[PDB]
Amino acid sequence: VNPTVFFDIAVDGEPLGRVSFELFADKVPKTAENFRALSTGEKGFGYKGSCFHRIIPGFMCQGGDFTRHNGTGGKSIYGEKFEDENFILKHTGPGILSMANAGPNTNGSQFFICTAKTEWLDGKHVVFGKVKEGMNIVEAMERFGSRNGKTSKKITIADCGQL
């Protein structure tokens, strides 16, 4: 019953592979629904064609800024921003999907996929999903990051949607 969404990832336009996520709609329904709808594009905007702008190996891959492509944009399906729904789930290790923010109650569209345990984020970022298939593809993406987060090649969501 929890939804599954996919991203098809490309590297300088060349297909890399597919990542699928389970969204924890049973625990964070509002947050899960935002990501789901942005991944299908059903509200007329969303993730398709957007990039992963910041990738720090051994930490995380951050994306979802589909309006400015650099970490300073994005919007939710509820408006520019929405509240921190709850902090029931924790950042327990690689594969966790979590909301980026700029302060309390400032969730938009930006998210990150953790490639390490990031326990210091517990209670500050809302965890709402986890990689189900294709963690190997996230690992391959990570190799195009750097210490300061700039990517060596352009990493994009070529297609996405719901499975």
From Swiss-Prot:
Positions of transmembrane segments: none
Catalytic activity: [protein]-peptidylproline (omega=180) = [protein]-peptidylproline (omega=0)
Principal subcellular localisation of the protein: cytoplasm
Residues with the N6-acetyllysine modification: 27, 43, 75, 81, 124, 130, 132
GO molecular function: cyclosporin A binding; heparan sulfate binding; integrin binding; peptidyl-prolyl cis-trans isomerase activity; RNA binding; unfolded protein binding; virion binding
Cross-link (Glycyl lysine isopeptide (Lys-Gly) (interchain with G-Cter in ubiquitin)): 27
Gene3D superfamilies xref list: Cyclophilin-like (2.40.100.10)
Regulation: Binds cyclosporin A (CsA). CsA mediates some of its effects via an inhibitory action on PPIase.
Modified residues (N-acetylvaline): 1
Outcome of substituting residue 124 to R: Loss of acetylation and interaction with TARDBP
Keyword Isomerase among record annotations: yes
Membrane is among the record's keywords: no
Effect of residue 68 to A: No effect on peptidyl-prolyl cis-trans isomerase activity. Reduced interaction with BSG/CD147 and ability to induce leukocyte chemotaxis
Effect of residue 120 to E: Loss of peptidyl-prolyl cis-trans isomerase activity
Changes after translation: Acetylation at Lys-124 markedly inhibits catalysis of cis to trans isomerization and stabilizes cis rather than trans forms of the HIV-1 capsid. PPIA acetylation also antagonizes the immunosuppressive effects of cyclosporine by inhibiting the sequential steps of cyclosporine binding and calcineurin inhibition. Acetylation at Lys-124 favors its interaction with TARDBP.
GO CC, alphabetical: cytoplasm; cytosol; extracellular exosome; extracellular region; extracellular space; ficolin-1-rich granule lumen; focal adhesion; membrane
Function in brief: Catalyzes the cis-trans isomerization of proline imidic peptide bonds in oligopeptides. Exerts a strong chemotactic effect on leukocytes partly through activation of one of its membrane receptors BSG/CD147, initiating a signaling cascade that culminates in MAPK/ERK activation. Activates endothelial cells (ECs) in a pro-inflammatory manner by stimulating activation of NF-kappa-B and ERK, JNK and p38 MAP-kinases and by inducing expression of adhesion molecules including SELE and VCAM1. (Microbial infection) May act as a mediator between human SARS coronavirus nucleoprotein and BSG/CD147 in the process of invasion of host cells by the virus.
PANTHER family noted in UniProt: PEPTIDYL-PROLYL CIS-TRANS ISOMERASE (PTHR11071), PEPTIDYL-PROLYL CIS-TRANS ISOMERASE A (PTHR11071:SF490)
Protein name: Peptidyl-prolyl cis-trans isomerase A
Organism of derivation: Homo sapiens
Lineage of source species: Eukaryota, Metazoa, Chordata, Craniata, Vertebrata
Gene behind this protein: PPIA
